[PDB]
């Protein structure tokens, strides 16, 4: 098989969310427990997730990303257009039951902006402020089933979206992040997780991510700096490598 094809690479799924759904989680409230973008799934090829590696000695504050094979490819280009596909699997038993609302909202994501990172605002995604009634959604019953593959066709007022994503996104730089995704899926309970005391009081919500119907526009990244792979240093005291971009 041709393994260098963009559809074979961007068609290899990867786990980007593993959320914890507890019996206490409230209805029409995003499942925030467990991971760094809890409940909110930015719909796009680029990477939405990053963590800051800090080393003191002043601090350097290096930022690291979590690319899936679809997000690794998009980073090589400036603009993207694709159909985003999400398998939302739940790790449970025959005795966990509950309903799950997975609705798509177009446009910007409600973000809590930090000096070095960028995350979602769970206060603005509740059933009072964010009613899912005028929203494309899929109510998944967990009585016996576990999963659903949700494909989101490309919808935007732009022919292509940016591939920057979370690269250099913070309180000052937040425009290119919003213009890198067509929207977001929010996973919210419609019915609290019913569970006896004979089983776990929490289930895991695993989400695989991949792309279909892909086109990439120009072979130059939109990033301030070049494409760089993170080589984890041995010890946490060690500083990371920076590649020379001085042309002289």
């Amino acid at each position: 098989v041709d393994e260098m094809a963009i559809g074979y690479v961007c068609g290899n799924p990867a786990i980007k969310h593993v959320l914890t759904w507890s019996t206490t989680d409230v209805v029409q409230n995003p499942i925030s427990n467990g991971d760094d973008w809890g409940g909110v799934i930015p719909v796009g090829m680029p990477c939405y997730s990053k963590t800051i590696r800090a080393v003191k000695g002043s601090t350097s504050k290096t930022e690291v990303m979590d690319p899936a094979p679809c997000e690794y490819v998009a980073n090589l280009f400036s603009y993207w257009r694709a159909t985003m596909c999400y398998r939302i699997t739940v790790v449970k038993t025959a005795f966990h039951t509950g309903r799950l609302e997975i609705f798509f909202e177009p446009g910007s994501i409600p973000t809590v902006r930090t000096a070095d990172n960028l995350g979602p605002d769970q206060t603005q995604l509740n059933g009072t402020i964010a009613p899912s009634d005028n929203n494309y959604k899929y109510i998944l019953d967990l009585t016996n089933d576990t999963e659903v593959t949700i494909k989101v066709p490309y919808v935007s007022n732009k022919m292509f979206m940016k591939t920057v994503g979370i690269y250099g996104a913070h309180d000052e730089d937040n425009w290119n992040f919003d213009e890198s995704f067509t929207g977001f899926l929010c996973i919210r309970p419609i019915t609290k997780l019913m569970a006896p005391d004979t089983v776990s009081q929490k289930v895991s919500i695993v989400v695989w991510k991949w792309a279909e119907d892909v086109v990439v526009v120009e072979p130059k990244p939109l990033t301030s700096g070049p494409t760089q792979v993170y080589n984890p240093p041995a010890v946490a005291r060690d500083l990371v490598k920076q590649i020379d971009v001085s042309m002289q």
Partner: protein, 208 residues
């Protein structure tokens, strides 16, 4: 209701939308002008791995000196795309654009030879096919390296054997500076697919 944990393999696509192929094409005919469908074309493009590689005079420099550094960075396609695969095959192409700021000799010339990979210049002869250029009339070398291998696929990993595939030596009679761009020949391709590594983004040294 049956006590069961099963998968019904249900799939939903939103929006009552048109054909993605047709709309994607319409978009590329208005905002791109081309359609990249494979990543080998990116192994055919030439991209810089060092925009200044200084050398010493009368020194045979294996280009592994530079590519061992470059392959780990992830700056060029031949390195960024190598983190998705384990094997590779085919030859490689290197372009050396002269950026030498000083004049050392009346006649400056660049010469390139073959060399087994991971060898040193003291372990190999300056025989075999070569290519010579004169940076004053031709400031671009444009040499190519064939796949002269004992194996049909080369691993991006380390090995017990050594000198099992060919590489490049670079000789300059004077101290020259070079823009080094590389690519694969019309037969180069990578192996079989694996997962991605982490990516390194912006670094902000802040005063504490």
């Amino acid at each position: 209701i049956n006590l069961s944990n099963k998968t019904d393999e249900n799939t939903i696509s939103f929006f009552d939308s048109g054909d993605p192929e047709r709309m994607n094409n319409e978009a590329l005919m208005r905002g791109c002008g081309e359609q990249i469908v494979n990543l080998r074309p990116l192994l055919r493009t030439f991209r810089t791995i060092n925009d200044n590689w200084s050398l010493a005079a009368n020194t045979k420099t294996p280009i592994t000196d530079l590519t061992n550094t470059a392959d780990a960075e992830g700056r060029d396609y031949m390195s960024y795309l190598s983190f998705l695969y384990r094997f590779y095959r085919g030859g490689r192409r290197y372009k050396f654009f002269n950026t030498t700021p000083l004049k050392q000799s009346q006649t400056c010339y660049v010469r390139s030879f073959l060399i087994p990979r991971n060898y040193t210049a003291d372990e190999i002869n300056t025989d075999g096919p070569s290519h010579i250029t004169y940076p004053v009339i031709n400031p671009v070398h444009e040499v190519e390296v064939p796949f002269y291998s004992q194996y049909r696929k080369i691993p991006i990993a380390s090995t017990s054997d050594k000198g099992y595939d060919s590489s490049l030596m670079y000789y300059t009679n004077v101290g020259t500076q070079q823009i080094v761009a590389r690519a694969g020949n019309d037969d180069f391709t990578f192996g079989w697919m694996i997962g991605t590594p982490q990516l390194q983004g912006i670094t902000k040294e802040v005063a504490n």
